[PDB]
Amino acid sequence: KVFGRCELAAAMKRHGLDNYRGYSLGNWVCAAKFESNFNTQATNRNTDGSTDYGILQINSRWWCNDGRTPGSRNLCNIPCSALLSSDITASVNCAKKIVSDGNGMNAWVAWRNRCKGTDVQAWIRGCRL
Ligand SMILES: [Cl-]
Ligand SMILES: [Cl-]
Ligand code: NA
């Protein structure tokens, strides 16, 4: 599924991401925009053989099992394919674990490079939330 910006904002809000670990909702929308272009089916192979999955591009190196990242962990205890669902529950639940992991949203390269230190509230402007 390709979400609209306010559609995804609403879903992220419903799933308790707004201000989760102190990150306002616009942070999560901005991260999703640049990670996946709001596409829940987005996948990207990393140089090390791991793969990032779904709307928040969660990495198989640590967070989910895809059966092809030797040596990796599965800290969200899910198949990576669960992160590609039209329903973002699995992605949000996993994101909450990632953002709790020590480096906060810096875990998301796109967030650090393209969202952090910018007017992220702009991502939720005009949405009925
Ligand atoms: Cl694996
Ligand atoms: Cl933080
Ligand atoms: Na894994």
> What is the per-residue DSSP string for 46-110?
-TTS-EEETTTTEETTTS-B-S-STT---TT-SBGGGGGSSSTHHHHHHHHHHHTSSSGGGGSHH
Name the nearest CA neighbour of 97 among 129, 41, 56, 69: 56
Q: Which two tokens stand for residue 77?
A: 């205890």
Length of the chain as a residue count: 129
Active site amino acids:
35, 52
**Which among 6, 24, 30, 102 has a CA at the least distance from the CA of 62?**
102
Ligand nearest the Cα atom of residue 80: 3
Beta-strand pair 58-59/43-45: unpaired
Task: Check residue 45 and report its DSSP letter.
Answer: E
* Cα(1)–Cα(55) distance, integer angstroms: 9
The 51-53 sheet, strands edge to edge: 43-45, 51-53, 58-59
- Relative to the alpha carbon of 61, which ligand is closest? 3
Contacts 24+ apart (CB under 8 A), 48-51: 51/80
101 carries a ligand binding annotation: yes
Cβ burial, residue 93 (10 Å; 0-12/13-18/19+): middle
CATH number at residue 85: 1.10.530.10
Helix (H/G/I), strand (E/B), else coil: 117: coil
As a whole number of angstroms, the longest Cα–Cα distance in the chain is 44
Bridging pattern class, strands 51-53 and 58-59: antiparallel
Quick one: tokens of 52? 């990032």
Domain count, the chain: 1
- Domain extent, residue 93, equals 1-129
The values of phi and psi at residue 31, to 5°, are: -55, -50
